[PDB]
Design a protein around this ligand. Structure first.
Ligand SMILES: Nc1ncnc2c1ncn2[C@@H]1O[C@H](COP(=O)(O)OP(=O)(O)NP(=O)(O)O)[C@@H](O)[C@H]1O
Ligand SMILES: [Mg+2]
Ligand SMILES: [Mg+2]
Ligand SMILES: [Mg+2]
Lengths: 642, 631
DNA sequence: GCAGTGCTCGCAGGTCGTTTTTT
DNA sequence: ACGACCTGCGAGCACTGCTTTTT
């Protein structure tokens, strides 16, 4: 583990950091992940720290996964390290200490779908018909800022989201209480409740801080008030906290992420040491230059840059097309050309501000028989068929999971319907009972028709499943739940239609077998992770061109990148245009992220005209193109300078 | 009219009766009806009375009409006559001028089905919720009362009951009937009764058109009617009622055996006229009839002497099953018709409408003409009824009961959920339904269609008015879109035009519907609409006051001739059914045949049956016939 | 432009009670 | 045996209103 052998000099210094706090600024391509793992390896090896004591924190599972494998190769006793998501940590903490704040065994975690359920119910009598999601987001940003239904409606300005302080705040008020009644927490709770647990019960904070003596928090620019608070609490005792971020890459301010957190970090921790990694290995010099010039525009953020390390590669180009249709045609003309130049589909990707944009693009590649992968924004990431099965699992684990019940009741159809269902629910509400136990007593207590049995059968097979969970392995249990539920059969028709949703379900079952390989482990446990998995994180690249939003692009890189619809009111989104400068800066950060993702060549497009939501209008051109004028060549349809 | 030459002395004086209450009382086929007919011809011809000045009230307008031509045969002046049922008149009383009592021009009548739609409606609300969910039970108790003139308050005050439940159900049912501005049958009377007593000034005005008052088939007559009568009369007592106690089969409907008899106590002046001779039946028939009836002990004592020589024997045949019973009647109808008997002169009498289904089949195979009475209204059939709903609701906005049946069939875009949102609009505003609908733009489409129909009601004649609705409703289009089987459905709807044109010859609009609602089973609207030489099928009940040379009585069995209902009830029910049987035999003139099966099917289950207890009564007053007549 | 949802209006399959009469 | 009834389910229509998303 010789840091000077392993790493860059500036890296080695950051990896050499030991106690007290440090800020690590990592621009793109900076080999931050490597650096940070060795530091972990150094801390244990060189400074004789304990793995028990080290906590690494990231935002995504991919990240945490990469973190854990890499560590394993390099660090002995890697098993004993706590690397996970803010959420995954939150789960772990609350599963172990929930009872101190009134969470019973075994409470449930509501995913984003499940929230809506509740929301629709609580809406019934509030001043505010419309849409329920809206409200879901209102809550989510509220819980993210660490806001309470009370101090929400104490908000100076009454219409931050449509509806008055109280009309908004009431929904959140009601949503809270019912949620709690059901014995459950949403995804933000895992952070916000955990904060509250620490704050109330400090003695609990300690028992934890013995497991988190040293702390890495990645992407500290995306961090939010609530995540901020939690981190401070964890680190408050020993101040051994190293947060790696990049201020020019906060692109989730709508998620309520606070760029100020990382800016204020050396103000928050006056003693902290600073380290800056400005070296970009990933990208071309011409790319980086474009990127660096673009970015210096954002006002008064931390003084840093992208040090080139590859020769100034191929030029950056910017074609404009009359047609938003033409640009899609234009894009395919090129992916062909380059696939012919000797360059694989995997090597190339297309980035768009909004998902809508994928269709014209997609349809264009589809005409020149060009493989396409769309990092789905319209369609769930393996989510619908996975979360269903869990609904069975989660209802089998406790029969009072009425949210789980409402969802799997439709799949497959049991011949239970709006009438039966609501009857069973009216009765249940009226006697303080689980909808499912209502099912179980349909025949015993007067629910007319001989549907009763369709209700009694469901309870019967649910409870069959419950016995199984007690007496089976995780993998076998999903084989049981799958075949008995008949999700396979209904999905076999929709499977004959699809067949894939059947496959990653088999893949899920496989991953369940992998769960029991690693040491340690309750069924309840496997499910705790699965609930957070979006996209079934654990098969090699598809060999397609990739399509994704710029937001989606973050932390990924491609030899070839296409950035499309680089126009005013698209990029530099009109919405953000209303926000004034503060908003424009955020957009600029977004544009910046794309550029930094391109390794060898970057093509840019906009249209003369574009259609959105019906009609066709004159497309303006992106002001950020000004910001980088001269650092790119404009072009006709074929690659000609003009 | 020369009474003495045309009537028996006892009859000739009875008909001669000229003022004040009088009562004729006789056994069946005695001329009570016939003498009632001559009475009319007399007062016109002899006692110089305006025919405009008399009414005879019955239990079918055909009883009346065939009754009309009769005075015409006797005295010209059959035009100015007034003859109808209580209802046909008790409706005309109210309807012609209801310019008092508080009602509104354009009201509607609620038939049995109409009734239930409100009883199914206001039923959930009040505590009789469980096995009294059965809806029919309530409309009965709602109807038996309006027959005794009872209100909800005095229904609340009763011995043994669900009591305030019953009365409230009625209380609501009414304030909801009130709402739709429609009137249950009873009302027809009751409101008639009420009105007279409400305004003693208005009633006199009628007693000018009712100078002398005839009542036939007083046998059965409810207390609502009794008071109507008692009232209609009182100005100057000029009432004759005629009837037979042994022929009182309308108990279930509140017609009081005793209601009839106490007429003497009610009226002092009443001159009781008695009749002893039977003109209608062969002696072997009457002997059986007389032999039977004697079993209703503590009934009155009349007697029936034959005027006719004893005849062909009364015969009885038991068959293997209900088919073999229908096929037998078919076979025999064929034979008799062969002897030169005409279909017109034969009839089959059963206890329950259901029994007609099978008999017909036997008749169809052979290709014998038949006409059924009061089984499956042409005016019942979907095709017709819904357009009558268009008609009801066209004129009367408030008819939600109808609104229901018409909005759906012509698929107008209209929401099951829109309904419950609009019925809430009714419930919130306390509004007539259509108005809530009038003011999701199908509401504007229905309103301009509906508004039109009623606005185009007064400019258009009924015959072409119905073709206005039928086309504009699109009810045509729906029938043409799904009309392979539906073609018979528009054929009825074409027939509905023709029957309007039949109506167009006579001077008899909304009026039309009245008739349709009030139609007796034997009334003409119901008959022609639903060859003239045809066999006639009807219920023993309907048989009342008619006669047939040849009569079949099918299904003379326990649980059926007596009826399960009557048996369960014990004696008072038996004597009633028995009296029903006596009514059966008494329609025959020459030939009576009786049948039962050994096994009858109902509800898909073929079940053993046994001969009526009644056959036992007439031990050797009938021969027992194998399928072919022998033994 | 498309999607996510409202609500219609109809196959489809099972329960049930309907027969004691009439206006 | 039959006609009404009631659910259940799912293919249709036209309604409208919206930037971006991780666990
Ligand atoms: N005096 C008579 N002269 C000739 N025919 C008569 C005489 N009285 C009755 N009839 C006939 O015998 C039958 C019985 O007459 P009708 O007046 O219908 O009997 P009813 O006493 O009214 N009994 P019901 O059948 O109970 O109504 C009819 O055909 C009459 O025309
Ligand atoms: Mg689900
Ligand atoms: Mg008579
Ligand atoms: Mg009817």
């Amino acid at each position: 583990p010789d840091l000077l052998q392993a790493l860059n000099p500036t890296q080695a210094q950051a990896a050499d950091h030991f106690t007290g706090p440090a800020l690590v600024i990592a621009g793109a391509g900076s080999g931050k992940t490597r650096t940070l793992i060795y530091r972990i390896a150094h801390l244990i090896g060189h400074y004789g720290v304990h793995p028990g004591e080290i906590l690494a924190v990231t935002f995504t599972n991919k990240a945490a996964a990469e973190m854990r494998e890499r560590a394993g190769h390099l660090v002995p006793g890697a098993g004993d390290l706590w690397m996970s998501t803010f959420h995954s940590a939150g789960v772990r903490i609350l599963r172990t200490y929930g009872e101190h704040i009134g969470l019973r065994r075994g409470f449930v975690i509501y995913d984003d779908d499940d929230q809506l359920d509740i929301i629709k119910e609580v809406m019934g009598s509030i001043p505010g018909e419309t849409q329920p999601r809206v409200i879901r987001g209102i809550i989510d940003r509220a819980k993210s800022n660490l806001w309470t239904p009370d101090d929400l409606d104490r908000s100076r300005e009454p219409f931050i989201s449509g509806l008055p302080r109280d009309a908004a705040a009431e929904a959140y008020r009601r949503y809270e209480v019912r949620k709690k009644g059901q014995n459950a927490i949403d995804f933000g709770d895992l952070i916000t409740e955990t904060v509250r647990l620490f704050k109330e019960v400090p003695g609990v904070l300690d028992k934890v801080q013995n497991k988190a003596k040293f702390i890495h928090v990645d992407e500290y620019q995306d961090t939010n008030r609530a995540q901020y608070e939690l981190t401070r609490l964890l680190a408050s005792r020993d101040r051994n906290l190293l947060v790696v971020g990049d201020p020019d890459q906060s692109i989730y301010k709508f998620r309520g992420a606070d760029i100020q957190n990382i800016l204020d970090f050396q103000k928050d921790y006056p003693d902290a040491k600073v380290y800056m990694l400005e070296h970009n290995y990933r990208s071309s010099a011409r790319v980086l230059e474009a990127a660096n010039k673009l970015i210096e525009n954002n006002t008064e953020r931390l003084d840093k840059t992208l040090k080139p390390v590859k020769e100034a590669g191929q030029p950056v180009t910017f074609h404009r097309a009359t047609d938003h249709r033409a640009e899609g045609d234009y894009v395919a003309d090129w992916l062909t050309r380059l696939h012919g130049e000797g360059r694989a589909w995997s090597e190339m990707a297309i980035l768009y501000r909004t998902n809508a944009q994928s269709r014209v693009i997609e349809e264009s590649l589809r005409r020149v028989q060009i493989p396409a992968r769309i990092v789905g924004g319209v369609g769930f990431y393996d989510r619908r068929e996975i979360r269903d099965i869990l609904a069975y699992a989660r209802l089998a684990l406790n029969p009072a999971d009425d949210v789980a019940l409402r969802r799997i009741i439709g799949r497959p159809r049991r011949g239970i319907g709006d009438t039966a269902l609501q009857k069973l629910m009216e009765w249940a509400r009226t006697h303080h009972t689980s909808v499912l136990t209502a099912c179980a007593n349909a025949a015993e207590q007067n629910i007319l028709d001989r549907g009763a049995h369709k209700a009694t059968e469901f309870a019967g097979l649910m409870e069959a499943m419950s016995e199984a969970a007690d007496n089976y392995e995780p993998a076998a249990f999903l084989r049981f739940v799958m075949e008995t539920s008949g999700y396979l059969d209904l999905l076999r028709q929709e499977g004959q239609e699809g067949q894939v949703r059947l496959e990653n379900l088999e893949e899920l079952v496989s991953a369940a077998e992998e769960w029991s390989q690693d040491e340690a482990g309750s069924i309840a446990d496997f499910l705790d992770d699965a609930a957070l998995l979006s996209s079934v994180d654990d098969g090699a690249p598809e060999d397609a061109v990739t399509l994704m939003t710029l937001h989606n692009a973050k932390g990924l890189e491609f030899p070839v990148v296409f950035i499309v619809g680089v126009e005013q009111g698209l990029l530099p989104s009109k919405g953000a245009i209303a926000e004034g400068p503060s908003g424009i800066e955020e957009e600029r950060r977004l544009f910046y992220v794309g550029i930094t993702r391109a390794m060898e060549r970057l093509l840019m497009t906009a249209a003369q005209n574009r259609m959105q939501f019906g009609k066709t209008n004159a497309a303006e051109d992106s002001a950020f193109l000004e910001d980088i004028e001269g650092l790119f060549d404009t072009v006709d349809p074929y690659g000609q300078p003009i």
